[PDB]
Curated annotation (Swiss-Prot), chains A, B:
Protein known as: Beta-lactoglobulin
Keywords, ordered alphabetically: Allergen, Disulfide bond, Milk protein, Retinol-binding, Secreted, Signal, Transport
Disulfide linkage: C65-C159, C105-C118, C105-C120
Encoding gene per record: LGB
Species this chain originates from: Bos taurus (Bovine)
Cross-referenced PROSITE patterns: LIPOCALIN (PS00213)
A GO cellular component entry from the record: extracellular region
Post-translational modification: Alternate disulfide bonds occur in equal amounts in all variants examined.
Length: 161, 161
């Protein structure tokens, strides 16, 4: 569904702290509630020597903000990883400069229209218009129906409260 | 995929304590590890007045056994519920006597061959052959490739260690 991947990515380079500045889903319900399925906040990204992608993220669950740790296994394509689970789910890195922003999407494979959410990761808790634009441009073709945006205050808060 | 549902079920009646005596999946990887995707242990089932199905279960995660709480929303069919999440996943109650055992399956809808696990819930931490048989019979048509069985000792242990 996602027809953008960035060429010649250096996954080890996207290691560190990230701020989920914004997010978008193809179905309102994927992000609607606080406990909505794909409403996750990225704490940090750590690539493993083997070239896999460990993701740290907060997630509102059962009444309170819960930390979570995920492993996305590399595949033959550098910018595409698969996180270990049910129904099959692929992570795609669309574009990044390693030091400012990162656009990446997650889709459940088959005919994922009933599965796709993208985020705009930034390094600092500032609103980066330049980044927001590339996000908005990237999603332009994408069949998104919900879009969230967070402010610096919220970004320095657990689960962006 | 699952062509067995039990007629005239009384969901309020399946409330209480349950022991996951055994489990089966259509893909070895759904149950292979300790951290395998569908390797969940049922603590108890609580139906809500509205007719929904709250499931309590343990799950080995990130190195230790974690408690988890799930809500399966009723649908027009009494024995079929949908738990609130990504990729779409349906819970089916195949057969039960409320007081001894419960057979129920979980499948991700579409062409779920890459999605189906069933369990044999019992009320006591004893091995119930009668129950095991109905489980084994029910699964007979089902394309299962992994099957686990737990002993009383394990059943009185968190995450069946
Ligand atoms: C949607 C989405 C992402 C995936 C989140 C996932 C797949 C989290 C895993 C959660 C776990 C294992 C369980 C749970 O939430 O209960 C990532 C950050 C990759 C990219 C931005 C969009
Ligand atoms: C497979 C399976 C079941 C489903 C388990 C589910 C769907 C658990 C939810 C887990 C959560 C929300 C997240 C996680 O594991 O990270 C039930 C007990 C219905 C019936 C027996 C087979």
């Amino acid at each position: 569904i996602v027809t953008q991947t960035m060429k010649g990515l250096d996954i080890q380079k996207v290691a560190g702290t990230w701020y989920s500045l914004a997010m978008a889903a193809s179905d309102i319900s994927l992000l609607d509630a606080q406990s909505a399925p794909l409403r996750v906040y990225v704490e940090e990204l750590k690539p493993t020597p083997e070239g896999d992608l460990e993701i740290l993220l907060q997630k509102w669950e059962n009444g309170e903000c819960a930390q979570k740790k995920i492993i996305a296994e590399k595949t033959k394509i550098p910018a595409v990883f698969k996180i270990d689970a049910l129904n099959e789910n692929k992570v795609l890195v669309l574009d990044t400069d390693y030091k400012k922003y990162l656009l990446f999407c997650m889709e459940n494979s088959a005919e994922p229209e009933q599965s796709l959410a993208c985020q705009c990761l930034v390094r600092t808790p500032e609103v980066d218009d330049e980044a927001l634009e590339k996000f908005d441009k990237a999603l332009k073709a994408l069949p998104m129906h919900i879009r969230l945006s967070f402010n610096p205050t919220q970004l320095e808060e657990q689960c962006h409260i």
